[PDB]
Symmetry: C2
Subunit: 325 residues, 2 copies
């Protein structure tokens, strides 16, 4: 009976903003209390930037009211080279006064021009900040944009349950299904079977699970080692590896790290082929968000983001979800 209490993080300078408000409102369906915080780059000691920030806050309060999202907004002014500590401090200090959000909601980072680099470069920090402060995190990904309360969807919502998460992905999909925007859809729960798993038992146990929770969902089990999917993904990967192509203890440590990199890339591509085969036309896909790298290198962030962009390439809407423990 746990439900998300949301904390939205945004960077200010329009589409991703209103999309995020719409998703937040549909998750909450008028209940709860949501905190929306916008980060505005400027001088935190300047009165002119302060009232600029309170104009933004007023505009955000109006918007929340329009999408019928119950809560309040807050603007935070930071200087450019301090966005990192300002964000992580907000997460540690939110609800010093009483409320405590248990769920962070953010947008997938953009990284096409130089303006976006502050939001791209803090992505891993935000993911770590959530789990370290006992919050789930939700990451919305999509250039195909998100419906408002004016629309009625009725296609597929696919929950891929491929990690032990206590059913967190499933809860998010079930919660959307309760809102009128998504109520018409068909919920599907897709398990991915490894070579040693028992597909029939996975199907039966998932069916008994949703039956006992009285959830109207279809159950499907797909094979990660599918011959066709594996051949296709391998051939695709080799072509990708050629584009971006344009003593003993530390030796073998180097080989092992490269091995795992190549292996992780082949896996991402195989997952993408599987998602395209089964959910190319799905209106919503919910996935676990994998553990981010422990290291702060720029290559580590670039690799993490690329892994996930490759994995979810050419899909419509993806929501990544990650809990705490």
């Amino acid at each position: 009976n746990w439900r998300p209490q949301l904390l939205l993080l945004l960077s200010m300078q329009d589409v991703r903003y209103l999309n995020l408000l719409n998703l937040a409102s549909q998750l909450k369906a008028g209940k709860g209390l949501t905190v929306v915080t916008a980060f505005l780059q400027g001088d935190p000691t300047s009165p002119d930037d302060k009232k600029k920030g309170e104009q933004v806050k007023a505009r955000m309060d109006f918007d929340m009211n329009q999408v019928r999202l119950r809560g309040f907004a807050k603007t935070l002014v930071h200087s450019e080279d301090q966005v990192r500590g300002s964000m992580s401090t907000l997460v540690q200090s939110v609800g010093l006064g009483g409320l405590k959000p248990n769920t962070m909601l953010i947008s997938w980072p953009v990284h096409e021009r130089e303006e976006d680099m502050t939001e791209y470069n803090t992505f891993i920090e935000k993911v770590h900040a959530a789990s370290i402060n006992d919050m789930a995190i939700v990451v919305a990904k999509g250039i195909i944009d998100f419906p408002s309360a004016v629309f009625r969807m009725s296609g597929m919502i696919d929950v891929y349950w491929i990690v032990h998460d206590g059913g967190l992905c499933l809860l998010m999909g079930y919660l959307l299904k309760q809102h009128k925007v998504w109520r018409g859809c068909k919920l599907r729960v897709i398990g991915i079977a490894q070579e040693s798993d028992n597909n029939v038992k996975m199907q039966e146990d998932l069916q008994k699970y949703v039956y006992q929770l009285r959830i109207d969902a279809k159950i499907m089990i797909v094979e990660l080692a599918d011959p066709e999917i594996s051949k296709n993904a391998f051939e695709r990967t080799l072509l990708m590896e050629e584009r971006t192509m344009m003593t003993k203890t530390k030796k073998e440590r180097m080989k092992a790290l490269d091995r795992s990199k190549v292996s992780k890339m082949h896996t991402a591509v195989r997952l993408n082929e599987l998602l395209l085969q089964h959910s190319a036309n799905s209106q919503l896909i919910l996935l676990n968000l994998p553990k981010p790298p422990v290291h702060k290198d720029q290559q580590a962030l670039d690799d993490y983001v690329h892994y996930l962009e490759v994995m979810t390439d050419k899909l419509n809407r993806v929501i990544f979800v990650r809990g705490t423990g």
Copy 2:
């Protein structure tokens, strides 16, 4: 009938910490709700630094309990190069959950070894952060240390009322006078008369003021242009200026800026002579905190701090106070 609701800021690594708790407790006398935040330098994405931070928080909760200061504590982990944005963000975001501190309490910054430079270099930022977020600020200065509830003081508390502050300095002194530690003292309100002020009228009007507020305070008016004080300060300044000694529009702009620097230094020294003449043996001195520089240069901070250190040199305990407007 306004009263301060405190927010203490500390940097962690012992004496200044407990001194600050004692002053906070004496201002509040068991009432209100106080937030104590400690800044711990580390990795905000590291679990090991997180539970380190919660040990500190537990130790602080115990200490507040001992000095009978009602409220709670919070530890914030930041990296070293992000202390600036982490502090200013805490001030903007404290009481997102309900409570709203209206008064920041900090310690005068230390700047003797390289460990202190993070706290010294954020001093002006903290002063601006308070006023921009509609908070008064209180700055405790003293190497001669502060009494705990075990002691009874009975010397002089001198409120220098030399700026239009709505009586904020006086309120702070009156509040201490209500606590048993300071109740035995004699409160003195000292006005400083410029050459064109009318000393007799200043005295009469201050006496009628405290009479109508039913405050037991003595009233004294001193002359800033005192011949002896002015001669002494001038001779002292010339000696100081020799130690640290070891087209037309921008020309005159340069001369004017140097003029005001030399003039500000002579004034600081004159004020210090006046405070030593009248309050050398006072147990507590309360002063307005002057507007900090608008510029972020390192020389601007160095000059601001030096001005105030020169002004309050060789005194026992000084509390600077600054409101909002």
